[PDB]
Amino acid sequence: SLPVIAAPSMWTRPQIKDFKEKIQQDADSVITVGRGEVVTVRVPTHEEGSYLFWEFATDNYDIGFGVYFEWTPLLDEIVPVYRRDCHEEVYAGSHQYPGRGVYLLKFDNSYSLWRSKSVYYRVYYTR
Amino acid sequence: PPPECINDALQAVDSQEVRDYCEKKGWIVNITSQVQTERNI
């Protein structure tokens, strides 16, 4: 049979100001998504069974967010892209590695005609 | 330390401190600097 993929986990936590100021230290962890733009963050390949952790937030507005997995071009839909209010709270989640491959974090502003978004993000994995 | 257990913990108690603790013990690794970015319109 084809691999069964684990359901992702998602949660929020209330301290956004502290997150941003912490993430602001590394300037490359903060990216501007232009009007009508989609920025895809590609996480380096890791071993099966591990977990990817992601966190993100924005300043003044919501942004579209989803997660796909690219096998070592087959893609799987982990977290469907949807708009989140990550300006109100820090958004975080996790997924178990189905196999060896690249994770794609989609920050999707494509619906926004007049507004650029500032995205503060961070990622971990388990050894 | 099972990854499944690290995962379960981070849902309930999530904080910078817990993440720091797990990173010190070598359980999790911060890869944010090692990513590639692709920008489409």
Residue numbers in the entry:
A (entry chain A): 365 to 436, 474 to 528
B (entry chain B): 16 to 56
From the paper:
ACBD3 is a Golgi resident protein involved in the maintenance of the Golgi structure and regulation of intracellular trafficking between the endoplasmic reticulum and the Golgi. However, in enterovirus-infected cells, the ACBD3 GOLD domain interacts preferentially with viral non-structural 3A proteins, which causes re-localization of ACBD3 to the sites of virus replication. In this study, we present a structural, biochemical, and biological characterization of the complexes composed of human ACBD3 and the 3A proteins of four representative enteroviruses. The crystal structures revealed the details of the ACBD3-3A interaction, the 3A-3A interaction causing the assembly of the ACBD3-3A heterotetramers, the interaction between the ACBD3-3A complex and the lipid bilayer, and the roles of these interactions in facilitation of enterovirus replication.
The first strategy was based on mutagenesis of selected surface-exposed hydrophobic residues of the 3A proteins to improve the solubility of the respective GOLD: 3A complexes and their capability to be crystallized at higher protein concentrations. This approach led to a successful crystallization of the GOLD: 3A/PV1 complex with an L24A point mutation within the PV1 3A protein. The overall structures of all solved GOLD: 3A complexes are highly similar to each other. This suggests that neither the L24A mutation in the GOLD: 3A/PV1 complex nor the fusion-protein strategy used for the GOLD: 3A/EVA71 complex affected the overall fold of the complexes. Analysis of the crystal structures of the GOLD: 3A complexes revealed that the 3A proteins formed either one of the crystal-packing contacts (as in the case of EVD68 and PV1) or contacts with the second 3A molecule when two GOLD: 3A complexes per asymmetric unit were present (as in the case of EVA71 and RVB14). For instance, the poliovirus 3A strand β23A/PV1 binds in the antiparallel orientation to the strand V402ACBD3-P408ACBD3 of ACBD3, while the aichivirus 3A strand β13A/AiV1 binds at the same position to the same strand of ACBD3, but in the parallel orientation. Superposition of the crystal structures of the enterovirus and kobuvirus 3A: GOLD complexes reveals that the enterovirus and kobuvirus 3A proteins bind to the same regions of the ACBD3 GOLD domain, nevertheless, the polypeptide chains of the enterovirus and kobuvirus 3A proteins have opposite polarities.
